[PDB]
């Protein structure tokens, strides 16, 4: 049904985005149930939805049998080109600590 | 937004200030024959019908609001049909 | 032990509108919703609609569509049932009920349970 | 002017068996399930048949429910003084996209 259970007070666009708290083993299955035609977010920065497909993100990795958030990184953010970056967070993003 | 990878291709993104860089990323494979339903999922059913939710098969077919069902399922049918078990109705004499 | 608690007694001049609260206890708030039912003084039950736990999701009855507006507050565990432009009509006691279903297009095929004590309000 | 139709009352002596019908369509009973609550006076209506035929815990066997084509039919067996109440049933109803409530039925057993 819910891409993670386990993963309380979050949804599967949640899930999906990597919002911090909601992470956690997404289960494989044979069947899956699409319960959200417009699939939201709980929490976290304020997105424009509607100006992307982003909303349907959790429908499609449900489409799959094997889902896996990656580890490590697609890319070094900080090297990246246009000059060296400092990474920006903002609180309506707290982590398992908080901040 | 998100941009899908094929099996073993790179993809490409063009930028100026304020850009996302994707860090972690979707790892997908195999498929799921997916449904349109409603939580919670209460109890076990043979069957899963997009309109009736569970259901347990019973006669080999049904009548009905026909949409995408999976599992062990009756099959859909346009009238509801009878097997003649029996004789020709004859008058008495 | 599965709880609802509601906000207290309200009166309204005809024009005004309501908010009524309804916190939740002793489940999982996000894995459920909330209908809400009023019955006029000596009268018989009006569902007026749903809200889902887990997305907001929204069903209004017809004849409440324009007036009613449901929200909820996963934090608090709590839904709310706002209704606009009040006239006499409206006297009821406003039951909120935790409902079984939760996500999909609401359709009756779930069912609601636990009925909180209801909260009255007058509309002069 | 209910959706569903329910006599405004039934009745019976200690003991006796009293039914109580619940009338309504294809959109509604014919294709829904259908729920009944109990009231007493001045609290909250409680649940004491699901899904047409079910019991929840602590409801006793002598509440039976019935369904037919669009109507439906509660059942009050050996009844008893503190089965005096208000009883509604309730279905869902795909005409009028929301749950719908009968009239409801005052229950009098002295």
């Known amino acids: 049904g819910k891409l993670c259970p386990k993963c309380l007070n979050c949804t599967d666009l949640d899930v999906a985005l990597g919002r911090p708290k909601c992470t956690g083993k997404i289960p494989s299955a044979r069947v899956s149930i699409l319960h959200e035609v417009r699939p939201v977010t709980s929490g976290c920065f304020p997105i424009m939805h509607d100006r992307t497909k982003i909303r349907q993100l959790p429908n499609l990795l449900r489409g799959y049998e094997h889902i896996r958030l990656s580890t490590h990184n697609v890319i070094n953010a900080e090297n990246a080109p246009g000059g060296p970056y400092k990474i920006g967070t903002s609180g309506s993003c707290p982590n398992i600590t908080n901040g | 937004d998100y941009m899908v990878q094929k099996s073993g291709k790179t993809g490409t993104i063009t930028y100026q200030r304020g850009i996302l860089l994707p860090q972690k990323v979707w790892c997908a494979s195999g498929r799921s024959k997916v449904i349109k339903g409603s939580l919670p999922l209460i109890g076990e059913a043979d069957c899963l019908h997009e309109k009736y939710g569970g259901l347990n098969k019973s006669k080999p077919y049904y009548t009905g609001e026909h949409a995408k069902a999976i599992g062990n399922c009756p099959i859909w049918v346009k009238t509801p049909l009878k097997l003649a078990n029996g004789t020709k109705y004859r008058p008495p004499a | 032990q599965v709880q609802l608690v509601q906000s207290g007694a309200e009166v309204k001049k005809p024009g005004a509108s309501v908010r009524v609260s309804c916190r939740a206890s002793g489940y999982i708030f996000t894995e459920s919703g909330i209908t809400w039912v009023r019955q006029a003084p000596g009268q018989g039950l009006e569902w007026m609609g749903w809200?889902?736990?887990?997305?907001?999701?929204?069903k209004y009855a017809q004849k409440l569509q324009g007036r009613v507006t449901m929200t909820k507050d996963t934090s608090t565990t709590t839904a709310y049932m706002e209704l606009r432009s009040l006239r006499y009509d409206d006297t009821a006691v406003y039951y909120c009920?935790?409902?079984?279903?939760?996500?999909?297009?609401?359709?009756?095929?779930?069912?609601?349970?636990?009925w909180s004590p209801g909260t009255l309000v007058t509309v002069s | 002017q209910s959706v569903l139709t329910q006599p405004p009352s039934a009745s019976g002596t200690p003991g006796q068996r009293v039914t109580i019908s619940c009338s309504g369509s294809?959109?509604?009973?014919?294709?829904?399930?259908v729920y009944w609550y109990q009231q007493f006076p001045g609290t909250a209506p409680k649940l004491l048949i699901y899904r047409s035929y079910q019991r929840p815990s602590g409801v006793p066997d002598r509440f039976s429910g019935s369904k037919s084509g669009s109507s439906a039919s509660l059942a009050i067996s050996g009844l008893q003084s503190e089965d005096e109440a208000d009883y509604y049933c309730?279905?869902?109803?795909?005409?009028?996209?929301?749950?719908?409530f009968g009239g409801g039925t005052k229950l009098t057993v002295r």
């Open positions: 309730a279905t869902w109803d795909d005409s009028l996209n929301g749950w719908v």
């Open positions: 809200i889902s736990g887990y997305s907001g999701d929204t």
């Open positions: 294809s959109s509604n009973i014919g294709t829904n399930y």
């Open positions: 009920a935790r409902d079984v279903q939760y996500s999909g297009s609401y359709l009756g095929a779930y069912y609601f349970d636990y």
